[PDB]
Amino acid sequence: TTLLNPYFGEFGGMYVPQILMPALNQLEEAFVRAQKDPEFQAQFADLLKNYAGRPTALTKCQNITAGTRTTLYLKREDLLHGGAHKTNQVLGQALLAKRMGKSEIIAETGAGQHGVASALASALLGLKCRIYMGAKDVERQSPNVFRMRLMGAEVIPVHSGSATLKDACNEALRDWSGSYETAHYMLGTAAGPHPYPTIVREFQRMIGEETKAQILDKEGRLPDAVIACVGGGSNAIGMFADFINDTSVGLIGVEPGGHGIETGEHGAPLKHGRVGIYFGMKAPMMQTADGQIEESYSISAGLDFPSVGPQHAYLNSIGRADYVSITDDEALEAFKTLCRHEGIIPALESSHALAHALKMMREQPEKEQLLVVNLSGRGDKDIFTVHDILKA
């Protein structure tokens, strides 16, 4: 039994070894209590404002939409301390860990952005941070690995399996199964077993709440659509949440199309995968015909989660949200375009969301539409990757 519904339609659940259920139940109870605690909310708000820098700006991008009837705003999570939206929820989860009397933090990371966020939050709040990262990702994310260590976190390479994010996820779970007594597993996306999809959404909900207040102030109306990239689903559900009940507002999630859906080398399980059970949840996933879990390919390291948050799968099924895909090349073009025309270097993850907004504009230039793209992070971290590519 649980206090909150672990499912979003058929998706979600708590598919973890019996040994980990007490940890999940404890976390859910702590979360529910924290949500009704004015003191907890005050502390969380204080950190978000005075440490992280909230609220983040809502920038109107006038140059890129010239010659069309599209008005585009960018929610600037790239300006948040750390460089990405990941910081919002790690601060909340860190406070939850402390509320439960835990002194250690376990985190998984692929691109390293959530890892850095977990490390900085742990440094600030006096938590012993342990981070698992696929050996293959460690090798290609030396900068982030150093930042994590600089901030006092222990980075542990995972050589098992494909040595990537999914393998790091498994390692985190196996560790937590025998340490939940003193350590909290700070999951980095809106996926995994209940209560994580719910907690991450609630601790990222300020993205959409701020966007709504800001767009009403600037345009006097709600957007026609809000657009966000979808790796695990946290930045997107953070943007979508406050708009779910505003039926006139379209919710568009963008999965990575990699080299193209038809090549099989992509990371779009929601629309091109098959439902399965892994990482503690029932959700669409990248898997073989036999049922073995596969990796998600994308030029962007952050859209590597081989599955997707259960709430996104649910919103898709009932038609509330629409999901599409953007290829490596389309993301690269959007990245270059924003740099040159707005002076903003977007994360390659976020570039997928921008690329789709640009498509909506370009395909129907005379269609009047107010769009908001969630700029989940800055792309200073992708400068080298983009360089190697263009140079090639």
Partner: protein
């Protein structure tokens, strides 16, 4: 049915059961089939067999590598079921249980999975990442196909869980490594088999004395396999000596 007969026969002999675990196809189909026959000839009262899975988030390093070795051999679920059919055709009474990960059971349909288990002769299925809380579809499909759904009774459990495991479990209750054993019996739970960390004969005798119907050992078994990869014959020899020792302790 096979678990029922086994425990009844073991009870009439005042002895516990020793159940070894190994990954199917590790280090290869042929050698695995030989390993399994050796374990049986050595004294194994029952078998727990794992189907290679990409992300065994419930297994330590030893078994993680067993799966790695199995995959290196190209082992697939379909082949595992062919092996199971063969094993049953050779050994009609030994209980055979599978250790599965949820996606392999859910993949082509839960009912279909248990139906396949019944056709090849499997006796039980323990799905590692399916807690009692999410077990309904699984134990229902298991029962419909005369397969015993195995549940894990953790050490950090409570009365509520004990009652659930006792009413939902069949074949045997997987007791993670006393007081719980008594409670299970009080609630008419399936015979308890202690697992996790069992690597010595004394541990097997200890389990039986605590009131458990037997003990399960895997990593210790798998370690013998990995440390004799280059010596197929020696591997079997060592396996026989280990199982015989562990089995002797159950008497």
């Amino acid at each position: 049915e096979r678990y029922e007969n086994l425990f009844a026969q073991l009870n009439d002999r005042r002895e516990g059961a020793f159940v070894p675990f190994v990954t199917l196809g590790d280090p290869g189909i042929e050698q695995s089939l030989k390993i399994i026959d050796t374990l049986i000839d050595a004294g194994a009262d029952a078998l727990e067999l794992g189907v290679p899975f990409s992300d065994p988030l419930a297994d330590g390093p030893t078994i993680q590598n067993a799966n790695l070795r199995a995959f290196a051999a190209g082992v697939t679920p379909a082949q595992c079921f062919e092996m199971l059919a063969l094993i049953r055709e050779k050994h009609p009474t030994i209980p055979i249980g599978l250790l599965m990960y949820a996606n392999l059971v859910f993949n082509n349909g839960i009912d279909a999975f248990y139906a396949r288990c019944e056709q090849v002769g499997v006796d039980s299925v323990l799905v590692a990442d399916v807690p009692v809380e999410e077990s309904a579809p699984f134990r229902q499909a298991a029962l419909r196909h005369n397969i015993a759904p195995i549940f894990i009774c953790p050490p950090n459990a409570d009365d509520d869980l004990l009652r659930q495991v006792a009413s939902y479990g069949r074949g045997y209750t997987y007791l993670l490594s006393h007081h719980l054993i008594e409670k299970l019996k009080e609630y008419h739970a399936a015979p308890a088999l202690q697992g996790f960390g069992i690597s010595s004969p004394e541990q097997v005798s200890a389990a039986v004395r605590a009131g458990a119907a037997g003990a399960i050992s895997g990593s210790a078994i798998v370690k013998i396999i990995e440390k004799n990869l280059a010596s197929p014959k020696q591997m079997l020899a060592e396996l026989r000596s280990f199982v015989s020792a562990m089995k002797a302790a159950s008497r």
